[PDB]
Ligand binder design. Structure first.
Ligand SMILES: CCCCOc1ccc(OCCCN2CCOCC2)cc1
Ligand SMILES: CCCCOc1ccc(OCCCN2CCOCC2)cc1
Ligand SMILES: [Cl-]
Ligand SMILES: [Cl-]
Lengths: 148, 148
């Protein structure tokens, strides 16, 4: 992955997000509810020290993890988290990768709605990536624990 | 679905195909190996009477079904099968739909290779359809029973 958000203000991504779409390098990273990269983002909480606290749902448990910051403002560690793109107000695109290469990305949105602009920009960003599974969820599913 | 292949010669789609990509209206139609629309096409055999015999794999059993012809050359019955597009020699795009509306489509290719033109044309055809899961398989997986 070589698309990172230039000049990211991590402070301004704080608050509520919806995992609208997810894609991944291997089907088995996203196919089941229990699949390893099937994580639904609930809230992003940037620390004052510039680390990133993530609230997510995983099959339906609430979970807290911290993405520690790096020399690069758009990259964090946990497995690396890269912020591709965001307008802070509506959408955020990010990716997760390990070091084998297993890779998963998400289109996050602020509200439980189908943002077609945000999905275009998501599909554009995936054209360069070797994804073999893509999921997308409706407004109903977005308002349920673990998108059931 | 309102993209059908004009002037389809069903005779000329006979022989060997590979289920390279699959998309579907609902995740649960494609997520597991046992998912209802997770069918891998092996061979297409058009009858002289103009019906279509389908050999497929389903989780790993071989299976035979006949798609009976209709007044429209690009539409068959089993649940309806619509042939969107094909160049006979390389790719075929089709869709399956019931009457609720549960809908699944496939990019078939002649050989076990990743045809980027055929996937473009597949993605173009899905832009108009309400798909929530898409899968794609590598050359290795294409040469295995049920794409394991
Ligand atoms: C731009 C910031 C968005 C980053 O959001 C996430 C980054 C990494 C994630 O990783 C999930 C890792 C899975 N954990 C271990 C297994 O149980 C669930 C938590 C999840 C969200
Ligand atoms: C252009 C012709 C391609 C059509 O290929 C297929 C059409 C319909 C299919 O339907 C699968 C229905 C599932 N059957 C019942 C459940 O067990 C497996 C067979 C499969 C391939
Ligand atoms: Cl939708
Ligand atoms: Cl591939």
């Amino acid at each position: 992955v070589t698309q990172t958000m230039k000049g990211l203000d991590i402070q301004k991504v704080a608050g509520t997000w919806y995992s609208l779409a997810m894609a991944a390098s291997d089907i088995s990273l996203l196919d089941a509810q229990s699949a390893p990269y099937r994580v639904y983002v609930e809230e992003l909480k940037p620390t004052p020290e510039g680390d990133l606290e993530i609230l997510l749902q995983k099959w339906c448990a609430q979970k807290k993890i911290i993405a520690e910051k790096t020399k690069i403002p758009a990259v964090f560690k946990i497995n690396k988290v890269l912020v591709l793109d965001t307008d802070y107000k509506k959408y955020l695109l990010f990716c997760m990768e390990n070091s084998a290469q297993s890779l998963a990305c998400q289109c996050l949105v602020r509200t439980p709605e189908v943002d077609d602009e945000a999905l275009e920009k998501f599909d554009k960003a995936l054209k360069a990536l070797p994804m073999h599974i893509r999921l997308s969820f409706n407004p109903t599913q977005l308002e349920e624990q673990c998108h059931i």
